[PDB]
RNA sequence: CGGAAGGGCACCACCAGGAGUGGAGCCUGCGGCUUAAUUUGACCAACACGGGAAACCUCACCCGGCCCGGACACGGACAGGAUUGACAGAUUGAUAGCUCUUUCUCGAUUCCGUGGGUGGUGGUGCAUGGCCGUUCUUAGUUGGUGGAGCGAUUUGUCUGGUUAAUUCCGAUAACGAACGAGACUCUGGCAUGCUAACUAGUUACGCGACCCCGGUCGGCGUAACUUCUUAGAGGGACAAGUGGCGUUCAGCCACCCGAGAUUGAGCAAUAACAGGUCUGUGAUGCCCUUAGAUGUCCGGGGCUGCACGCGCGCUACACUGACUGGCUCAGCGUGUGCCUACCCUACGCCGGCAGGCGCGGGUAACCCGUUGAACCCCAUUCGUGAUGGGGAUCGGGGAUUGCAAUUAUUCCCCAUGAACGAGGAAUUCCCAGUAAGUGCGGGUCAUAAGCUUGCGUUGAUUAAGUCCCUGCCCUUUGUACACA
């Protein structure tokens, strides 16, 4: 009944498109839905030396990865959940469907 | 680069000519008489021989030592 | 016996146990986030991993 | 390599039942993951398929730490003639 | 999955997956005009699209080499059997791919002209 | 290019200053010395650099001892053996069958001679790729058409003004342009307007506790909502308005209204250097070694060694201070790892302490955690004394990590109590939430920050200029250099 899907991604545009597409599917099937809740973004940050050897001006990079997690709540049987989730998913977004 | 001490040679292991015939004895009747002993352990049960040394017995595979 | 001491030093910690997963190098490893790769190879494959200098 | 007959047969039968085999470049692996029941350490795997490479039976490429080996056709007929097999049965990379 | 690995090292591990896989297919398919991969990772399915120039050459006779490449990828990464499928696709306007033209120029130079 | 001239720019330059360094103790790097070895690269753009905090490993150096992990091809020895292993006793350091003696094996894998390899942190970065540093993050660079010249070339790219800027304006044989700059991306700020939320909260409501209707509660449950929290789409500032200065141009200064009237970084380029890296590599040519190995392993040692000199920093020299109680506030983050063996911790007992033993939470806006961080603030003690400043050196003990701490890994307790009284010549960095003080995360990590990379907090003096010094750039000039 109280299904809860979680969408992790590295991109922002694709993830907003996926979650908006899923709530459009839930609106078309006319379901009560909780809005797309945004978790705070994770910024994986690695600071390495640019130089392979040791000499130079001490120059550092700032490589960062961003992880965006948006999650949705729906109220439907499992068949509806499988039918909506099995369609329309962008290749970069990773999905986790929890039940309770 | 040069060395001082002479080298430690490899152990040139001694070849034994017809080692299986030294286990048994020849009789003019067709019966088998075994000279030296046998190892009783698990995977090497019934025909696996032991080493006959000057002061004790030994089998390699399971490391069995029969002291006197 | 030889195979009883051939690799018998405990590699349970320390720099000699862990290594780069591209070079098998032992110098400048990032073990943060489970990279386990040397810093030159992380600079090489950062855009392939996903780490980008947005800033 | 002083490899056992049984370990070499294990190597050749996995290589002939699937046409490829992979291996992390590690002498100091205890025991090989992709065929892990009859013992065959990764040392035995690496040096056996090095002997298979050197007389032109298998093809080798290397990505970061892993050997990847592809069995060629003259390697197929060699490994069949070694393992004493009928000419119908093939590796999985050949049949559909 | 009861191993339940964190998301931070999860995305890092997927990135290292694509990095090792990109360099592996780079050393394999450089004669074919390999330009890259895109992994469409479904749950319970995994499509992995190779983008190159000579797709017949990367596919092989009866598709043999793409079969053994699928077997190599699955056996190296420990995937379930039949979970992944490789796919050869030809890049559009292969002149405008800097990677494929660099590989072409590489094979021309080791061909030996000026 | 100049050991010429003239313009310009810059807190890696100066002026006004601030905090310093250089003086002392210690940390750590470099040279020297010493040594079995105290390996090595680098010497503005080397010197707390190689992400280099080395007990082992790392590890390349030294002293000893194992292994082949010498593929494949050829030729010999033979299931009347090719030969791998092998516990006693010697021996060794070692339970290395390494060697010596002795004998059991193992089920053609092999061994022995020869080609041929292969491996290497071995040499060469003055053979090389890639990457990086520098010139310089300065402002420099280039065609098309049109002038000049026989031509190489030149003007455009400028006398000036202005700008952070070859940024524009404006003169003008040039006119239209591209790269750089700028624009762009990430970030900080502002939205009571939008989107949304039991993994964030507020306000009410009802119980519960306590104090004398009301007050407090991160005590407990639910009705609205999104101000606070989170993050998406938008919007928002452009010198827009006013007044001066200036061809009235480019622009500059001041002020209103305003969340802001220069937020900070990333990317950064015709070119060069015989700058660095062959010790990041299964990137690599050539050379060298390749079985008594420079391959690889194991054991020990060294990389720490101390008459000296230099560099990066930490602690301080105290009363604006120290000590002891008391009160009260954060933001970055990270957290159970493929191999891979090692996670952050609440809460409860024991102990002064470091710590030890129990059950629990957490793959994380869910648990540590409302991260009760320091400095700061409040109240004592001190009293100008190398004193309760300072905490080096050194002794005795107690815990943790690890296979192992001795040359003391670290931490704790007691005692010892050194120079140091504000640092000569010289010299570093910086202008707004900046410097400086202060603590906290990350990396390295079994143990672990005197380092580096980030984060917050408390938060200024001075300046809104210049070419005087040091740098570099442009123009002109000179050249017999042009591998300059
Ligand atoms: Mg290292
Ligand atoms: Mg300056
Ligand atoms: Mg010295
Ligand atoms: Mg080591
Ligand atoms: Mg080395
Ligand atoms: Mg070896
Ligand atoms: Mg190669
Ligand atoms: Mg070795
Ligand atoms: Mg004193
Ligand atoms: Mg002492
Ligand atoms: Mg100076
Ligand atoms: Mg002259
Ligand atoms: Zn036995
Ligand atoms: Zn690497």
UniProtKB/TrEMBL annotation, chain D:
**MF terms (GO), sorted A to Z:** RNA binding; structural constituent of ribosome
Residues bound to Zn(2+) are: 64
Q: Write out the GO cellular component annotations.
A: cytosolic small ribosomal subunit; nucleolus
Where is the Plectin/eS10 N-terminal domain positioned along the sequence?
A: 3-96
Where in or outside the cell is it found? Cytoplasm; Nucleus, Nucleolus
Question: What keywords would UniProt list here?
Answer: Cytoplasm, Isopeptide bond, Metal-binding, Methylation, Nucleus, Phosphoprotein, Ribonucleoprotein, Ribosomal protein, Ubl conjugation, Zinc
Q: In terms of one coarse class, where is the protein primarily found?
A: cytoplasm
Source organism superkingdom? Eukaryota
The subunit structure is: Component of the small ribosomal subunit. The methylated form interacts with NPM1.
Function per UniProt: Component of the 40S ribosomal subunit. The ribosome is a large ribonucleoprotein complex responsible for the synthesis of proteins in the cell.
For this chain, the family text in UniProt reads: Belongs to the eukaryotic ribosomal protein eS10 family.
Instruction: Please report the name of this protein according to its UniProt entry.
Output: Small ribosomal subunit protein eS10
Look up and give the organism this protein is from: Oryctolagus cuniculus
């Amino acid at each position: 009944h109280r299904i809860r899907i979680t969408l992790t991604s590295r991109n922002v545009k694709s993830l907003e498109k996926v979650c908006a597409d899923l709530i459009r599917g839930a609106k078309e099937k006319n379901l009560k839905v909780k809005g797309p809740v945004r978790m705070p973004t994770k910024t994986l940050r690695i600071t390495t030396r640019k130089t392979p050897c040791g000499e130079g001006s001490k120059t550092w990079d700032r490589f960062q990865m961003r992880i965006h997690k948006r999650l949705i709540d729906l109220h439907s049987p499992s068949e509806i959940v499988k039918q909506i989730t099995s369609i329309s998913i962008e290749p970069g977004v990773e999905v986790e469907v929890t039940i309770a | 680069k040069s060395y001082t001490t002479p080298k430690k040679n490899k152990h040139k292991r001694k070849k034994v000519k017809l080692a299986v015939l030294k286990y048994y004895k020849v009789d003019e009747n067709g019966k088998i008489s075994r000279l030296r002993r046998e190892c009783p352990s698990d995977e090497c049960g019934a025909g696996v021989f032991m080493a006959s040394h000057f002061d004790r017995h030994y089998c390699g595979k399971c490391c069995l030592t029969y002291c006197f | 016996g030889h195979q009883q001491l051939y690799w018998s030093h405990p590699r349970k910690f320390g720099q000699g146990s862990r290594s780069c997963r591209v070079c098998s190098n032992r110098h400048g490893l990032i073990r943060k986030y489970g990279l386990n790769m040397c810093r030159q190879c992380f600079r090489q494959y950062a855009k392939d991993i996903g780490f980008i200098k947005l800033d | 390599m002083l490899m056992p007959k049984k370990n070499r047969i294990a190597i050749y039968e996995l290589l002939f039942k699937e046409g490829v085999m992979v291996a992390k470049k590690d002498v100091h692996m205890p025991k090989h993951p992709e065929l892990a029941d009859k013992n065959v350490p990764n040392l035995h795997v690496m040096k056996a398929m090095q002997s298979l490479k050197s007389r032109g039976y298998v093809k080798e490429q290397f990505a970061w730490r892993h050997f990847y080996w592809y069995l060629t056709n003259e390697g197929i007929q060699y490994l069949r003639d070694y393992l004493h097999l009928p000419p119908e049965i093939v590796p999985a990379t050949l049949r559909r | 999955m009861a191993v339940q690995i964190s998301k931070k090292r999860k995305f890092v591990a997927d990135g290292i997956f694509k990095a090792e896989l990109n360099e592996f297919l780079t050393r394999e398919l450089a004669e074919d005009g390999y330009s890259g991969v895109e992994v469409r990772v479904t749950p319970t399915r995994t499509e992995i699209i190779i983008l190159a120039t000579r797709t017949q050459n990367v596919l092989g006779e009866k598709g043999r080499r793409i079969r053994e490449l699928t077997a190599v990828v699955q056996k190296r990464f420990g995937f379930p059997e039949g979970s992944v499928e490789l796919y050869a696709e030809k890049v559009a306007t292969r002149g405008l791919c800097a990677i494929a033209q660099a590989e072409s120029l590489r094979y021309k130079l080791l061909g030996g002209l000026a």
